Each structure stands twice: as structure tokens, then as C-alpha cells.
């Protein structure tokens, strides 16, 4: 799909302007799939909160998944852009949605070591969900040796 590609590519490149153009002075449906069937919010430059926001404000189903059941929140969290992780959340994204391997957002954060994310997520996350390796956030936090994390988790 054309515009799917025009809007996704923009997103991906973090070009806010285009994203705002193609959205407004062009009228592309945020959810428009690209030739790979992914929407832009899905492939966007995760560190570009402004793009995330812009998309989510024109709609954009925050709750969507990958072939591997991955989604905006997994990506964000895994990448560390909490700023965006929030946006996603603040717009209804579901934090407790497991990825194909069972890991959920917070698993990724711990895995990557994004302390503030882990902090941000822990609250609202089911710290009991098991990893594909059977681990819960804490058990992995431990398996890793993420002191600071283990601590956040403890509560």
C-alpha cells in the first residue's frame, strides 16, 4: 500500500513534518498498512515521541502486534524511550501484553537495563508473568544482576 509506505517511511525516519503533512494536508489514515502490513506507529522512530504523539492523536491503534506478537510498548521499552512509552500508554497502549516469547514490556526493559522504564512499568505490570525462559521480571532482574532493578521490582 502506497500511503502506508509514505507515512511509515516518514515515521521511521523521524521526519515529523512529513508525518504531520501526510496526515493533515494529505489525509492518510494513521493505521494505513505499508506493503509489509505494519502501520507507522509500529515502525516509527521510537525515540521520536513527537511522531508517536502525532500519530496517536490522529487515532492510531496503540494496541497492535507483530508477527512475533511484538508491539509499540515492547519496542519503546526495549529501546528505552520512556517518553514515548508513556505517550503510548497514556493513549491506551496495554502494558501487560506478552510478546511471542512470553516476555512482556517490563521483561524487555529489565533485559536491556532501562531502569526508569522498569520503574515506570513495574507498577502497572504483572510481575508474575513468566518469560519464555520461565522467568518473571524479578527472576530475570536477578538472573542478570540488575541490582537497581531488583530493588524497584522488590516492591
Amino acid at each position: 500500500v502506497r500511503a502506508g509506505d509514505r507515512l511509515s517511511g516518514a515515521a521511521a525516519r523521524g521526519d515529523v513534518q512529513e508525518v504531520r503533512r501526510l496526515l493533515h494536508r494529505e489525509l492518510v489514515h494513521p493505521d494505513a498498512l505499508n506493503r509489509f502490513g505494519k502501520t507507522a506507529l509500529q515502525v516509527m522512530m521510537f525515540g521520536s515521541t513527537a511522531i508517536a504523539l502525532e500519530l496517536l492523536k490522529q487515532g492510531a491503534s496503540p494496541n497492535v502486534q507483530d508477527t512475533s506478537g511484538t508491539s509499540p510498548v515492547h519496542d519503546a521499552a526495549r529501546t528505552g524511550f520512556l517518553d514515548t512509552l508513556k505517550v503510548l500508554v497514556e493513549h491506551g497502549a496495554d502494558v501487560n501484553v506478552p510478546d511471542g516469547t512470553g516476555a512482556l514490556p517490563i521483561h524487555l526493559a529489565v533485559q536491556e537495563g532501562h531502569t526508569a522504564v522498569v520503574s515506570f512499568l513495574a507498577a502497572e505490570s504483572d510481575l508474575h508473568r513468566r518469560d519464555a525462559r520461565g522467568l518473571t521480571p524479578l527472576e530475570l532482574a536477578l538472573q542478570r544482576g540488575a541490582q537497581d532493578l531488583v530493588d524497584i521490582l522488590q516492591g
Binding site: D5, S8, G9, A12, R13, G14, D15, V16, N34, F36, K38, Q42, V43, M45, F46, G47, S48, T49, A50, D66, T67, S68, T70, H74, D75, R78, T79, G80, F81, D83, T101, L108, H114
Partner: protein
Amino acid sequence: QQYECVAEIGEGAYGKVFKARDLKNGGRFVALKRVRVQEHPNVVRLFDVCTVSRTKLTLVFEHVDQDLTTYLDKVPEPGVPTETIKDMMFQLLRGLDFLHSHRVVHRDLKPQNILVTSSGQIKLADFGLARIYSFQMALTSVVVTLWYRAPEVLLQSSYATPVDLWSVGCIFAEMFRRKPLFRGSSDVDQLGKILDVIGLPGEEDWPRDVALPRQAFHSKSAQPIEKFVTDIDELGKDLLLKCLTFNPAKRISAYSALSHPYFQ
């Protein structure tokens, strides 16, 4: 296969570049640069070389969801913290230096080829993708960003390694600035802009052949860079100008810049 395309990031100097998933092991976004033929922390790592036909290759590269621009365009009203700048700047040079030795010349150091992790680690890249700025004020007209192209190149004289250094100074400036320093619409216009700040170099610093000779330009000043790169410090001012020097032979080296007292 062991990767899953999710989008054409874009298309440019190097074919189309895509964003994919490294499920091969798991998760992580990655970039695919399709190629037909017939280690450093601050540089995007080549991860794989898939053979798409026994030759077509598909290079799988490290990728990051943030570039120097979205970051700057994001930071709090006061700005990037002094040390943060100093830091990115050091790495930017560090990987730069690494590139140079091993005789590689980046040639395209715009802030979009500059990735910054949520962590803050800087990793250079090269997508060969363009970005086209439309212009502000009445006589609007597009320009692709050459705002980081060295004089030597605008002049079409030299294309030597110092080329990259010019580009870094332009960036350094933009870290204090959060807006590109020199932003014109034409090669000659760009030249103008550089000169209003740095000032008409000496006849002895400009090259012969060149279609745009020194005489084509006015002398007009040599304005104090700091009324532009607001808030830089004295040691930075030195390094900045050591990059931003019209004459490439007389332009600081990456290797050297790295040893500069700004990083004391």
C-alpha cells in the same frame, strides 16, 4: 528467514534502506541495505551479509531509534547539558577518528547520519538518504541539506578527509544551537553564509581552478562565532573554530581534536 522487514526507511544514494526485526536471536530493530556487486562502539556495526542470489548481498546493520536531530529537537528549553555535548562530541570524534584511520572518509556527516541511544551512546551511520528543506519566508525554495558540506566541496576543489571535520564543527555548533548553523539554498549562497561568520579567508587560503574565486565574495568582517553558537565555552570555541576553518590543510584533525583541551 532470520530477519523480518517491517518498512522501507527510505531510498537514496544507497538503494532503499529498511527497518527489520532481528528475530534471528530476538527483538532488536535492524537496517537492511540491499547490495549487488556483479570494531567500534561509536559506529554502527555490520551484523550480517545475507546472499540473496548466488551476487546480491543484503547487509544487516546495527540500528537505533533516535538520531541527533530528534534528540536536540526534543531536549528541555535550557538545552543539552554542557557535559552531554562534550560527551557526544567526544564520541562523535572518537568514532570519526576510527573511520578516518582505516582510510575511510565519511563524507556525509549530517545530524541524521548521527544516531544517539536512549543511553546517549553515539554511533555514526550512512544511509545516503536526503531530506529536503522547503524555505522560510516569501521567496521560498527547496534545498537538500548541504549545510554540512565543507568549502572544499562546495568549491569543488578538495574532497580530502578534513572534509569530515568541517561537518563536525557544524554539528558541534548545532549542539549548542539546536538549529543548523549555516543554512543556505545554493552552493554559492551557502558559501556566503559560511563567510559572514568565519569571514573572507585570505587570498592565500582559497584555491585556483575553482569556479567561485575569492573575488566573487566580499570581505565583510569575521564575526565572533559566539554570537551564533550561543553559550559555548572558550575551550570549545577554540575546537569549534579549529574545525570550521576554511582552509582544509589548516583544519584540525579528528585525531587531534580528540586530544584537544576541551576533553581535559
